[PDB]
Amino acid sequence: RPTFYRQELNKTIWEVPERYQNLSPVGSGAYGSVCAAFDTKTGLRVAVKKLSRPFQSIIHAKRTYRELRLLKHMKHENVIGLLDVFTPARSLEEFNDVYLVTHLMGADLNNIVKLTDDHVQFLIYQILRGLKYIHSADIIHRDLKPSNLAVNEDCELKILDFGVATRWYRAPEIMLNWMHYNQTVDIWSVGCIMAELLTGRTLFPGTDHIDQLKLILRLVGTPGAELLKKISSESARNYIQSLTQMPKMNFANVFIGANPLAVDLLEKMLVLDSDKRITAAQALAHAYFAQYHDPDDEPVADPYDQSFESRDLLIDEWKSLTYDEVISFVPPPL
Ligand SMILES: COc1cc2ncnc(Nc3cc(NC(=O)c4ccnc(N5CCOCC5)c4)ccc3C)c2cc1OCCN1CCCC1
């Protein structure tokens, strides 16, 4: 039970172990505030997030428990991982604040831009490697986009969720609930990201859900008979057939002058039918990534138990489950 010190910044009490020194605000919003800090135990530079009113409602409490469970399980080089979690509460009774600690990321993908073909290969490779890992434990990101990707000076990437319109990167089946989905909603997003790096521009910059679909269908074409057969909703089916029939464009006439193996991968990623879309694992083995792919260093995750998600609990039960998870936390080795 280490020594805590208090201090105020951004109009909020921070109460942290002495281990963590020199705190400096880096951004706050509805969900939590974040500080950079020096970690006197590893000489490393870290980021500390104070959750905003984590047990105010049933939604907040369950969400707080979800983030903590998730970060405790993720142990992979291309995925954010949990260095430490603490509370200044001595007991469950007085337990009201949660703090999460991770490696301090510098600049996101949004900030670091066009760019070389070798750079795109390496950046997209690392995202897929990280996606193979989380998808293997049935975890879906759902909000993959450049501002959720951290990239340091070595060009090393990590997937995270700081919590660019999201809709610009969203799979059309999730955006509209028009057809069932799987893990490959995130594969759609990656294709939108890769295109952007290849050409310097947002691929599909829609101004609402309808305009977004319009732009997308302009590129991939209206759904064929095969895909139209699996659209569950009657409304959605009508809309689509009531549109004016757009053809599939030739991707080489769109990504003009780009590396042909990347044009090919883009075509396997940006397919409308989600039964046909390439997975993370299959995509690691494509010829675009020949210089990086090693099937013996692209690991999968331990089984992840997410049954809690179907439960309807009271606030005090989620709060108590969170506290347990704080107490059983064992740090990762140096
Ligand atoms: C310099 O600005 C920084 C740096 C940071 N470094 C490290 N961590 C953080 N933020 C952070 C995030 C989290 N949680 C998650 O990342 C999270 C939650 C849920 N799910 C995931 N997954 C889903 C599947 O894939 C794995 C990821 C991740 C926990 C603790 C911390 C500390 C930051 C934050 C940061 O700045 C934030 C504000 N800033 C203002 C300028 C732009 C953004």
DSSP collapsed to 3 states, the chain: CCCEEEEECCCCEEEEECCEEEEEEEEEECCEEEEEEEECCCCEEEEEEEECCCCCCHHHHHHHHHHHHHHHHCCECCECCCCEEECCCCCCCCCCCCEEEEECCCEECCCCCCCCHHHHHHHHHHHHHHHHHHHHCCCCCCCCCHHHEEECCCCCEEECCCCCCHHHHCCHHHHHCCCCCCCCHHHHHHHHHHHHHHHCCCCCCCCCHHHHHHHHHHHHCCCCHHHHCCCCCHHHHHHHHHCCCCCCCCHHHCCCCCCHHHHHHHHHHCCCCCCCCCCHHHHHCCHHHCCCCCCCCCCCCCCCCCHHHHCCCCHHHHHHHHHHHHHCCCCCCC
User: Which residues, listed in sequence order, are joined to residue 51 by a DSSP beta bridge?
Assistant: 32
What distances in angstroms separate CA 239 from CA 2, 225, 248, 270, one per listed residue? 61, 15, 19, 21
- Residues 251 and 255: their CA atoms lie apart, in Å, by 6
Nearest CA to ligand 1 atom 41: 27
If you measure from the C-alpha of residue 198 to the centroid of ligand 1, how many angstroms do you get, rounded to a whole number? 26
Identical fold between 1-106+301-330 and 107-300: no
HSE of 256, CA atoms in CB hemisphere, 13 A: 3
d(CA 6, CA 233): 55
Name, in order, each residue with C-beta under 8 angstroms of 150's C-beta and a sequence gap of 6 or more: 80, 105, 106, 107, 108, 109, 157, 158, 160
Q: Whole-angstrom Cα distance, residue 96 to residue 51? A: 10
Resolution (A): 2.2
Cα separation, 227 vs 277, whole angstroms: 12
Q: Is 324 a catalytic residue?
A: no
Tokens of 171: 């799979």
27 close to ligand 1 (CB < 6 Angstrom): yes
Q: Count Cα atoms within 13 angstroms, Cβ side, for 67.
A: 23
Instruction: Evaluate whether 84 touches 101 at the Cβ level (below 8 Å).
Output: yes
Asked if residue 185 lies in contact with residue 173, where contact means CB atoms within 8 angstroms, the answer is yes
C-alpha atoms less than 13 angstroms from C-alpha of 233 in its C-beta half-sphere: 13
Q: Please give the Cα distance from 51 to 34 (Å, whole number).
A: 9
Enumerate the domain spans of the chain: 1-106+301-330, 107-300
Please give the CATH architecture assigned to the domain spanning 107-300: Orthogonal Bundle (1.10)
Q: How far is the CA of 244 from the centre of ligand 1 (A)?
A: 42
How buried is residue 317: exposed, middle or buried, by Cβ count under 10 Å (0-12/13-18/19+)? Answer: middle
* Cβ atoms within 10 Å of 183's Cβ, excluding its own: 19
Q: What are the structure tokens assigned to 5, written together?
A: 């010190």
Taking the CA atoms of 21, 6, 73 and 56 in sequence, report the sign of the dihedral they define.
negative
Q: Domain spanning 1-106+301-330: which CATH class is it, in words?
A: alpha beta
How far is residue 175's CA from residue 211's CA, in Å, rounded to a whole number? Answer: 12
Give the sign of the dihedral formed by CA 178, CA 184, CA 185, CA 191.
negative
Q: One-letter amino acid identity for 7?
A: Q
Rounded to the nearest 10 degrees, what angle do helices 185-199 and 260-269 cross at?
Answer: 150
Method of structure determination = X-ray
CB-based contact 100:140 (threshold 8 Å): no
In order of 84, 115, 164, the CA distances from 28 in angstroms are 20, 31, 18
- CB of 170 within 6 A of ligand 1: the answer is no
Marked catalytic residue, from 118, 161, 302, 316: 161
Q: Which residues pair with 159 in a beta bridge?
A: 79, 149
Give, in degrees to the nearest 5, the angle at Cα 305 between 304 and 310. 135
Using CA atoms, how far apart are residues 125 and 269, in angstroms rounded to an integer?
Answer: 14
**What angle in degrees, to the nearest 10, is found between the helix axes of 117-136 and 185-199?**
170
Cβ–Cβ contacts within 10 Å for residue 118, how many? 11
Quote the CA–CA distance of 88 and 1 in Å, as a whole number.
10
Token pair for 9: 């910044």
- Alpha carbon 236 to its chain centroid, in Å, reads 28
At 305, the amino acid letter reads D
Closest atom of ligand 1 to CA, residue 48: 32
- Asked if 124 contacts 292 with a C-beta cutoff of 8 angstroms, the reply is no
Q: Which residues pair with 33 in a beta bridge?
A: 28, 50
CA distance 308 to 305: 8
Neighbours of 23 (CB within 10 A): 15
Contacts of residue 197, defined as CB under 8 A and 6 or more positions apart, other chains included, come to: 113, 114, 115, 119, 120, 123, 124
